[PDB]
């Protein structure tokens, strides 16, 4: 038939929409990862990191999920925990938007707010304390280094892009947070489908640690408003070997592009979706990419950024 046993199995199969006010002669095509169980790309890894943990016995009945995240990964793990019957504790600074806090409370996760001045480090700290108090009961999924992260993109997101474009995709543009998306997609298309595309990583110009690293320059991260990317470091789940190009975008332009997506394309896209498009638009208007079909990842949806500068 086509009936999913729980909500975690309904992930993926996100659509491709062709942009009309970006690129040149419709060479920019976006992938709407907002059309997911919890309305973000993270739904794929929230599912697979849990499925994998079960498969190798690290996650069993009675066990409890504890992790640190202040983005869509928390919402992704939350719905999967609920759908599959796991208790879950998520740690994050008390600096979080009340909107997302109530959303998580609606999903039945134990909220642990760490000190604001501590930030994420304090969040990871508390989460690691909790696990340490009962290492037999608690399990941390660790999105940045868990191989289950980019693996699911190699098995789903990548093949979806390949099938929908009939293998005519020449470029993939994606922001980097955990790096799992670009890694899995690139690995899928370059190795499993054997086509030598151009993988483009997008990062904030405010915190361009990938551009700085590849050039041997001094790594100097910084604050930005492009939620979802710009971790300030190189994640283990970012495979540099498959990265062909690194584009940088500023927050202000990324915001503007996201507004343009709504008012002009009729696409409810997130902030990082604007950054990814703004970068692809730049490439698309290069005569070297005029022939090339450019597929862009739109990680999330607008209504998640209601209380932000997006509106």
């Amino acid at each position: 038939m086509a009936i999913y046993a729980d909500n975690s199995y309904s992930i993926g199969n996100t659509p491709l929409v062709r942009l009309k006010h970006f690129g040149h002669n419709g060479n920019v095509v976006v992938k709407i990862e907002g059309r997911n169980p919890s309305y973000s790309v993270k739904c794929r890894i929230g599912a697979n990191m849990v499925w994998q943990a079960e498969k190798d016995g690290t996650l069993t009945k009675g066990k409890e999920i504890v992790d640190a995240t202040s983005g869509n990964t928390g919402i992704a793990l939350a719905y999967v925990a609920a759908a599959r019957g796991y208790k879950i504790t998520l740690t994050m600074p008390e600096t979080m938007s009340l909107e997302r806090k109530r959303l998580l409370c609606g999903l039945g996760v134990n909220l642990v707010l760490t000190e604001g001045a501590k930030g994420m480090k304090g969040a990871i700290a508390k989460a690691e304390e909790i696990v340490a108090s009962d290492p037999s009961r608690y399990v941390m999924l660790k999105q940045f280094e868990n191989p289950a992260n980019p693996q699911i993109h190699r098995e789903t997101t990548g093949p979806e892009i390949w099938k929908d474009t009939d293998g005519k995709v020449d470029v993939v543009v994606a922001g980097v947070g955990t790096g799992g998306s670009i890694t899995g997609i690139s690995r899928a298309i370059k190795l499993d489908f054997g086509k030598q595309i151009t993988s483009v990583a997008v990062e904030p110009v405010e915190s361009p640690v990938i551009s700085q690293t590849l050039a041997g320059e001094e790594v100097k991260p910084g604050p930005h408003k492009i939620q979802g990317i710009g971790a300030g470091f190189i994640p283990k789940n970012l495979d540099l070997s498959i990265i062909d190009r690194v584009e940088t975008v500023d927050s202000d332009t990324a915001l503007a592009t996201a507004r343009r997506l709504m008012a002009e394309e009729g696409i409810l896209a997130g902030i990082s979706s604007g950054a990814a498009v703004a970068a692809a638009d730049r490439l698309a208007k290069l005569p070297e990419f005029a022939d090339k079909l450019i597929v862009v990842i739109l990680p999330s949806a607008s209504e998640r950024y209601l209380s932000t500068a997006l509106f």
């Binding site: 995240t69 202040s70 930030g119 994420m120 969040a123 947070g177 939620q227 979802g228």
Partner: peptide, 8 residues
């Protein structure tokens, strides 16, 4: 003003 890790 997302920085070291958040979020993600």
């Amino acid at each position: 003003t997302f920085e070291y890790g958040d979020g993600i």
